Amino acid sequence: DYLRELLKLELQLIKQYREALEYVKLPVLAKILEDEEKHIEWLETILG
Amino acid sequence: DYLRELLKLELQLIKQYREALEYVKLPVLAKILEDEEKHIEWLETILG
Description:
Two copies of one chain form a homodimer.
Chain A: H1 4-24, H2 27-43
C-alpha cells in the first residue's frame, strides 16, 4: 500500500532503466539507474 | 517510449512520494525523492 508506489514501481523502473540503457546506448543511464537503486534499496530494506 | 518509461512512470513516483511523505514523517523520503527528481530531470532535459 504505502510502498507499492514508492518502491514496487521503482523496481520496474530499475528494470526498465536496463532496457532503456541499450536503446539510448549511454553509460549515464546505467549510472542514473544505479544511483537510484541505492535510494530505492533504502525503501526495500527500511532498517530491516 | 523510452521516455514514457523513464519519465512519465518516474514522475508519478515523485508525486506518490510526496503523497506518502507527510504521512511517513521521514524527511529522508523528500531527500531521496529530491535526488530522484534530478535523476529524472536528466531524462526530461537530456542535454548531455
